[PDB]
């Protein structure tokens, strides 16, 4: 019935979009804000920010196609293809007004085409904790002076012959805990209950595969964004990144500067990759302030 | 016996600083030691060995923990494993210097021996891996061609037995996938050859030992930063595959910062597993390099 607890005042619902049944969680009143999660998680990573934004906004947090309780995409997993589903879902609830977009990890990959091709539909934009797919991702290190890299999963997930599925099947909880904790600075926030909920969700066979198909389409997304990036982004933009172990550090804003004309960036000390859960208070504060100012 | 011993060779053991090492020996004359790499054993040299034995005494040991060798008692860093390998070679050539041929992590486990005992090393052949130094931190996590060839560095080095946990029950699947994805000539890896390699490294202590070499890599980097203060002086050859899966120009490019007397070859259409993918041209280049002026 429900993989994750729905926050008070919110609603778990579905919408078919281009043949694909998307799951989403919606609440609040006012202009629309869409929150798009990343790999290893679902809409539920936003469950602490959602009631705060609901005080001024209509908040929708969908499950990415194939992840959570959304159906796999029927077109493909490249950024341009998935962005079609997400734009249509957001535009269905705010057809006359521009909306706000907050995105985390591969949520960036799956929305950037939508933003650059429909700038007038995007009022303000918040991107956190992942690169936009472009040639700069080819410079991430396979190995570092501190041991295992934070990005080796890019090639692991993208390997042919279903390597990752074959190796991870039957070990979904073990792998996800290793992936989450190795990208976290504050691992304390991931209780047994939270790790179980995420692991059970992405362990669904079609979800395990869908997770990696996003990475197998990464080269295709890079090529698409090389053409789309000819138009700079014009809406107000904020970037967030973890400054502790596991985060993007300075790279998040540095890359965004080549995309956005109007961008401010923050690096949150002692925080890793999973900002909404590791550093709920500072991150919620920065997002709420950015989207409230002048309104 | 895990792998068939070539006619005229013997499978034997020697104990070195408490660790019982396996090896295969044959021929007469000056000593050549052939050091294998990850995913394999001495047996990758079984085509070059009978050729070399016509002029040389050939010894191909199994790395500590791999094949039929016992795990090291000190550690898996380059300096630690080189002690076992240096003392083993000097047991068979205590009075004369010998030649060293090494492939993949065989380079990691012999370079400290070479730099500190140059008078013991007549000629040096290194193929298909970097010497552990800061350059390895520049390998790409992901490429314009898809999955990189080097991401296993971090996979193997991850904490909490990640690689062991995920590969357990899939040793043959993973090893076939790792080998073929690093090879240009996948046909030479028959069902029978893959089965022998998979059987060997699927031993619990061998699966772990395989990854411990990578878990010691940062320490090897720290060790080699000091050792490299002394350049290598003996004649040196490097070999690399120019096909999919190989080191390309980087093999010789890096060695130039280590050796004063080095020549390099990049073999077209060949991947990482030069002795098996491209036996004929590799064998010929090696035999010639160790035969000149002799």
């Amino acid at each position, epitope marked *: 019935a429900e993989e994750f607890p729905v926050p008070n005042g919110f609603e778990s619902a579905y919408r078919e979009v281009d043949g694909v049944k998307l799951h989403y969680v919606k609440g609040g009143q006012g202009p629309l804000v869409m929150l798009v999660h990343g790999f290893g998680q679902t809409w539920y990573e936003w469950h602490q920010l959602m009631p705060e934004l609901a005080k001024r906004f209509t908040v929708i947090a969908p499950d990415l196609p194939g992840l959570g309780q959304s159906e796999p995409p029927k077109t493909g997993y490249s950024g341009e293809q998935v962005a079609v589903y997400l734009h249509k879902l957001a535009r269905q609830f705010s057809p006359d007004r521009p909306f706000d977009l907050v995105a985390h990890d591969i949520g960036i990959w799956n929305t950037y085409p939508m933003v650059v091709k429909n700038q007038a539909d995007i009022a303000r934009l918040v991107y956190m904790e992942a690169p936009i797919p472009d040639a700069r991702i080819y410079r991430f290190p396979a190995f570092t002076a501190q041991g295992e890299s934070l990005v080796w999963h890019f090639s692991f997930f993208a390997a042919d012959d279903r390597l990752a599925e074959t190796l991870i099947a039957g070990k979904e909880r073990f792998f996800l805990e290793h992936f989450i904790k190795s990208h976290a600075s504050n691992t304390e926030v991931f209780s047994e209950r939270l790790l179980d909920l995420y692991a059970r969700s992405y362990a669904k066979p079609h979800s395990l595969n869908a997770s990696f198909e996003y990475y197998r389409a990464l080269n295709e997304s890079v090529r698409q964004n090389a053409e789309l990036a000819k138009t700079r982004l014009q809406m107000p933009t904020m970037t967030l990144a973890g400054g502790g172990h596991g985060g993007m550090g300075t790279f998040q804003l540095e890359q965004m500067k080549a995309y956005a004309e109007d961008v401010e960036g923050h690096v949150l000390p002692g925080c890793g990759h999973w900002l909404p859960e590791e550093c709920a208070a500072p991150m919620n504060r920065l997002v709420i302030d950015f989207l409230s100012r002048g309104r | 016996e895990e792998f068939p011993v070539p006619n005229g060779f013997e499978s034997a053991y020697r104990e070195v600083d408490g660790v019982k090492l396996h090896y295969v020996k044959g021929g007469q004359g000056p000593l050549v030691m052939l050091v294998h790499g990850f995913g394999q054993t001495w047996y990758e040299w079984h085509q070059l060995m009978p050729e070399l034995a016509k002029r040389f005494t050939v010894i191909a040991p199994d790395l500590p923990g791999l094949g039929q060798s016992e795990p090291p008692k000190t550690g898996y860093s380059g300096e630690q494993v080189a002690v076992y390998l240096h003392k083993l070679a000097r047991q068979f050539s205590p009075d004369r210097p010998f030649d060293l041929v090494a492939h993949d992590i065989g380079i990691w486990n012999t370079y400290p021996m070479v730099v500190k005992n140059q008078a013991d090393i007549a000629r040096l052949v290194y193929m298909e891996a970097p010497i552990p130094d800061a350059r390895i931190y520049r390998f790409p996590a992901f490429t314009a*061609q898809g999955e*990189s060839l080097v991401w296993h560095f971090s996979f193997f080095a991850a904490d909490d037995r990640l690689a062991e946990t995920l590969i357990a029950g899939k040793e043959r699947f993973f090893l076939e996938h790792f080998i073929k994805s690093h090879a240009s000539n996948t046909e030479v890896f028959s069902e029978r050859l893959l089965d022998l390699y998979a059987r060997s490294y699927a031993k619990p202590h061998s699966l772990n030992a395989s990854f411990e070499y990578y878990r010691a890599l940062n320490e090897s980097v720290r060790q080699n930063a000091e050792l490299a203060k002394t350049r290598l002086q003996m004649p040196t050859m490097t070999l690399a595959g120019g*096909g999919h899966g190989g080191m390309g120009t980087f093999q010789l490019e890096q060695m130039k910062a280590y050796a004063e007397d080095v020549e390099g070859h990049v073999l*077209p259409g*060949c991947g990482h597993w030069l002795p098996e993918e491209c036996a004929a041209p590799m064998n010929r280049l090696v035999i010639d390099f160790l035969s000149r002026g002799r």
Partner: nanobody
Amino acid sequence: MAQVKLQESGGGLVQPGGSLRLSCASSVPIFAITVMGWYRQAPGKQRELVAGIKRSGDTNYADSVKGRFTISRDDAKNTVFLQMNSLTTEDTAVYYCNAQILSWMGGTDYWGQGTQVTVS
């Protein structure tokens, strides 16, 4: 040296609606090549990717040619083929064979000499 040499066959002049099959052979076994691809460049325009095929067998195509062009791999002939169906004047360009070989530090690009394709 050069780690691969590429030799194209095919091309020429064809009428709208017609077909052509391009060919690219590799000096090394084609399995040693990570990505085989076809690019095209018309005068005064940018070089663009048309089709690519990986060792796995996965193919990818440009939007303007999806459904009309087909890239395929003949391991015995060490050859990659580009079947070009339903040609329009908008497909007129010089078509280049492309080989990408991945090494540990990264890939190396190799290009063929190119063949002229004119649709008129």
